[PDB]
Amino acid sequence: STIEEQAKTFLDKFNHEAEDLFYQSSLASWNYNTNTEENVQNMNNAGDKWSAFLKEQSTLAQMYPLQEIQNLTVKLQLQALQQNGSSVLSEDKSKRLNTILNTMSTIYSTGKVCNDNPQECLLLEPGLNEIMANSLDYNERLWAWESWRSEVGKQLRPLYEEYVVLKNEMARANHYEDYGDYWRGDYEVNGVDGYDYSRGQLIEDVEHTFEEIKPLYEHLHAYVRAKLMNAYPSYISPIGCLPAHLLGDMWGRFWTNLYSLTVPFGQKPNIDVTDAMVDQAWDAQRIFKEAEKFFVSVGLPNMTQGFWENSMLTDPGNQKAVCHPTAWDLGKGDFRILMCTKVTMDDFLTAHHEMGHIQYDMAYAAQPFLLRNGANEGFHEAVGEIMSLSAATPKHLKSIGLLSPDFQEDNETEINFLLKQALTIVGTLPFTYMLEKWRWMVFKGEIPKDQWMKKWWEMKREIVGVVEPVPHDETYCDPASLFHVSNDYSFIRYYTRTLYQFQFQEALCQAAKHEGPLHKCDISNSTEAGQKLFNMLRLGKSEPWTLALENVVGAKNMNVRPLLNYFEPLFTWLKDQNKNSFVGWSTDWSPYA
Amino acid sequence: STIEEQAKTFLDKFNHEAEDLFYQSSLASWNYNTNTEENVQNMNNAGDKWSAFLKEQSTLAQMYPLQEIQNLTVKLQLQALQQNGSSVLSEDKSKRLNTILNTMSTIYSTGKVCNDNPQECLLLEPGLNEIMANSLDYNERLWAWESWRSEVGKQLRPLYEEYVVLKNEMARANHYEDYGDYWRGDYEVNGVDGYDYSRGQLIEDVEHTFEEIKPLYEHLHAYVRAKLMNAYPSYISPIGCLPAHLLGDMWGRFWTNLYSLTVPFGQKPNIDVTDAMVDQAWDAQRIFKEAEKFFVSVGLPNMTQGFWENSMLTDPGNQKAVCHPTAWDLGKGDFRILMCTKVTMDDFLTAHHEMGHIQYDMAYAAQPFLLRNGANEGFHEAVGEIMSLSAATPKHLKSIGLLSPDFQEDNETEINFLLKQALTIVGTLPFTYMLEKWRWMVFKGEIPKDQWMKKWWEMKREIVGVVEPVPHDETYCDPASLFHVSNDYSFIRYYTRTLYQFQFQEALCQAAKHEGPLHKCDISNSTEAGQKLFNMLRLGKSEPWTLALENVVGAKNMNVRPLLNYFEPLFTWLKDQNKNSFVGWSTDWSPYA
Amino acid sequence: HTDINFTATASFGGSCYVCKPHQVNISLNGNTSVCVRTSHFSIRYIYNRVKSGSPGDSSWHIYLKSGTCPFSFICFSTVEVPGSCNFPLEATWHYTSYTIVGALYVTWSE
Amino acid sequence: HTDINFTATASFGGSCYVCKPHQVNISLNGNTSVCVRTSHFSIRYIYNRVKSGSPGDSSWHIYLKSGTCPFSFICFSTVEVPGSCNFPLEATWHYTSYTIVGALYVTWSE
């Protein structure tokens, strides 16, 4: 029988068993956060069983030679399934890497900085993040910054060195260049007519998409430093980089946060509807319902009843669970969101962002199990963020009745809002590029163990325009203090995410027949767009992501300009202020002589 | 008869006739300001008769060969008198240079900027000066700045070009290198044992006393720009020079003025006794009387009755005269001050500064007429300014009862005051050096007519760290908008003045047996000092200035350090602030793209 | 007289849950066709979901469309009979995908 | 009886004003000496500044010091006489410089 046809029914019976078991691992994880007594520790078992299963099925899809696979769909699944993966390691080395990943995950998860008060400690959650978010005492923020990067940082170092060894050895064995080359693999595609993407063509299309995004960044950067000096006098030099612990969070991943300082026209009525909501007695339920309602209008389905009936969106606090807003596609037509909602404009937009995830999930749940996923990493993240935009516009707030049409919408509130967005968005782009430009260089074996930190900050000052507030020797391991580093995630996705994110909103508002600046757009009511969108959503990881884009946009590859053109009004305004300010920075300055 | 002996009695009879006629020219000028009806225009006649006399006596001192003059005193007088001077010019060229000087003096004297309000004009006095002193509207200050440098500036250009021609031709004929070389001649001395000074040794001892004063200036400069940005946001770049019209007066000759902005510890009780006086019903007379009283204590004379009886120190305003504070040594034991006094701490210190001039005048009035003068230019100016210092100290104010001993004198009020002083003093030093560094280069024939302005501002930015707020082509003539430029005075004197000014206060406080910082010193009560001082005062221009200094200080030549050591506590405090600020500037920045 | 449960009992989740129900027994009072022998009767459509474990069921709907013939709710029948009446049975997950899982064929005589 | 103005009338301003008065006539009732012939008399020192034009005069003081002999204020005399009594006349500008411009010579007999 055609080995294609023989693999067809092999995959049929695989999908069946896999959907059953993956519903088991997912239901047990939900139950970890969701519910009583007897739920704390079954998650970890049923996950290893999933792991056992997946391992067997790879050892058995090796028997299906891809070359003889005509059906493009079965090829992909087969390809996906048959990856030797981590198992391709000396038994002990496979365990030792495991041992390492758990240790690193836990140290970060359970790391705390203390005070002659060795009992009193704050953690990363509330503790420090709440300080890096509000506090305006340079020395205090520096203490938070440094204490974290020291206590949970130096711990991570020796482990992280070992982690790159085996982690490479796993890639080098899987005929990838290095573990870095391995992660880029996600954006790869082979053997599809003029739709291909090279594993290393990502680096170039990032680097070459970066030179283009560099001008906008510098003017935003040189603008903030000026307003920062005014909040922290004495501390900030206008030739040199910004001192990390002043960027509004532990790492300076976003600048969203410390904004009240860098606000342009603080004279204006504030576009935080956060309290407008409270005044209308809005509960966590009225948010999501108004978000479901958003989607309905764009040609998509109302949430599955049952999503409603066992989705946790309020916080029990009486039970304790992980409040990091998540959207869950367990098997078996089962979708739900876990989110500890507060009556906020922020938690309101997060609702749209998470439910966007659910909508992507529901869209493609018909695709064979193995291909139920974002076209590539950070497709998913983008499809959630594209919703915030439409749902965080005055046009939206106005109509939704959370802000009265009385609202004067002059060019002043324009920047007011468009700035906050850039703090969050243009903020993170260069942070992100460097973080991975670093790991890429490490995983390649370019930076040695004795320069890791020196080459890190060299790059922080160089690319990102940020200086360490204290010298760090090589006992430190600062990138490791960030989640996605110690919990072993590709981070470059957050970058690609943002680029697509706009390409979408561009073509999607094009469909909604929008008129002015791209940021005023609000695709709701517009079924015309929702279908353009769904047409790619439902596809899952079924066609290559290059094509999946072309469905929504027109290009086989990411593009930078949609983003830039969204920020055009802010860009030509920041030059206005940086007419006299010093624009750019020197690697050479440091707050410590 | 010994031609020395024959010149001895020639000089006797000259001094007699000269003191008669010089009382006449001085009495008539006093009367120009002082008094009724029939006094407006006699000053101009009786001056030309003085001019007539002085010219004859040179044409007749040419008959007394200097080489055969043994008596060092008669040599000097003879030397002084027998200078061909301006007369050494083609009759028409002598007139034409006159014609020019008057025109230039008058355009500046009577130059006014107007508004579609061609009737409404302000002048330099009140008008503009009062704007450049108070106004905080960039555009307004720029309008004042530019309108003056245009209306009374472009007028001065063609005249100033012609003025350097004949003005040089007069020096070139008097066997000086250029008119610049001519002015430097003031600090010259020949044929006195190891006490000489070369005409060009001045430039070096200025330039080489400048490199020394450069560090202190930059830290003051980089400090003000920072505080200025805060007063004029948008306008001031922290890489580049300060925009002239922001420097507190039409030219930015002193920064004294706009200080309320650059004040360090504004929290402190203000050391302006200005209103303390008003509260004690102090009249213009109680000021000068308390200043006379100052001197008496230092071993010097109380004013000549008659100085009291026809000195104008209040302002008639009912009669109108020139209120620029002046001290008058007319002939014939006759001294008086013309000053339009207001009850102020400023007008208080000015009293001391003007009476200091009178005291110098009274001290040397025994020297033969021709030698009755400051040892060199700017000795006199220094001897007045050294009095302000002693009289503007807390120790003085405290004891004089104009400020209660209750006054807390911490390190805070320290800089508070020491800054204001540096605004005024360190402020003008570089301004001054450049202004003459420019004329020097002009009078040498280094800068051509088609670069005069370009080379001026190049130097303003370069040396002084100040930029023009608008581009000026060569129709302009900005140095000419300053008094001392259009009214034909050597300006470098204001520099040397300041240098000496401190060397004195140093050695004079040494004599007073002072203890702490040099700026707390108050030589009053201390006859020990006053005599050291008088010992040089009475000398007039009788021994060479190099010796005259050595009497008070110990060096044959000026020195920079006394000044620097006076400002030591400010200097080490300004580095403290410029730890992070950009210290210095770039020629390349301009407020006009 | 004679009553008639026309039952469509369904299970869920083959190689893809959501695509189509797993299995679906269609039944006329247990057996596959029923001819009425006592004038006047009563006929009803019962839909029966077999517990699967996920709240995905309950978003699975099987209903019968209208179709071939005049009335909408003489013999009845699962399976094809000449001159029938296909009230076809349509199965859908959450109104995303539709898939017709059978029919009720009817045969009149007047 | 006989009264006696002893007058010192002075002018000001030679090659240097302030250094010394210009000129100074010293006089015993107009002529140069006076011998008293009527027991009891009265003697006074008058000082006479000639208008010069500047308030510099008036800061010019000519007074007579004490000197050679017992009493301080028989014949009198401008000019030297054997066995006299020099009340010497001292002229000063503002107590800066002193210069003795003459004397009153007296001659007793008892």
Ligand SMILES: *[C@@H]1O[C@H](CO)[C@@H](O)[C@H](O)[C@H]1NC(C)=O
């Ligand atoms: C792959 O298999 C499925 C089975 O239904 C089919 O729908 C699809 O068209 C097949 N593709 C090709 C290219 O044969």
Ligand SMILES: *[C@@H]1O[C@H](CO)[C@@H](O)[C@H](O)[C@H]1NC(C)=O
């Ligand atoms: C779309 O939204 C507007 C206000 O946002 C509302 O008035 C209108 O009725 C909506 N219509 C539909 C069909 O969703």
Ligand SMILES: *[C@@H]1O[C@H](CO)[C@@H](O)[C@H](O)[C@H]1NC(C)=O
């Ligand atoms: C110069 O002349 C005056 C005349 O009195 C005299 O005082 C001075 O001593 C003379 N100087 C010399 C060096 O002869």
Ligand SMILES: *[C@@H]1O[C@H](CO)[C@@H](O)[C@H](O)[C@H]1NC(C)=O
């Ligand atoms: C000097 O000044 C102090 C106060 O400044 C005063 O009390 C003292 O009596 C003065 N003495 C003289 C002799 O001038």
Ligand SMILES: *[C@H]1O[C@H](CO)[C@@H](O)[C@H](O)[C@H]1NC(C)=O
């Ligand atoms: C259907 O009818 C049968 C008899 O034919 C009866 O026993 C049964 O309870 C009924 N079931 C339902 C769900 O109504």
Ligand SMILES: *[C@H]1O[C@H](CO)[C@@H](O)[C@H](O)[C@H]1NC(C)=O
């Ligand atoms: C048809 O057969 C089965 C017996 O196994 C039963 O479930 C069903 O009720 C029967 N129908 C009738 C009408 O008796």
Ligand SMILES: *[C@H]1O[C@H](CO)[C@@H](O)[C@H](O)[C@H]1NC(C)=O
């Ligand atoms: C001095 O005395 C004479 C008489 O000897 C008299 O006429 C004259 O008025 C007196 N002058 C003065 C100034 O007293």
Ligand SMILES: *[C@H]1O[C@H](CO)[C@@H](O)[C@H](O)[C@H]1NC(C)=O
């Ligand atoms: C001495 O002579 C003159 C006359 O010219 C006169 O001024 C003066 O009064 C005379 N003295 C006496 C005492 O007569």
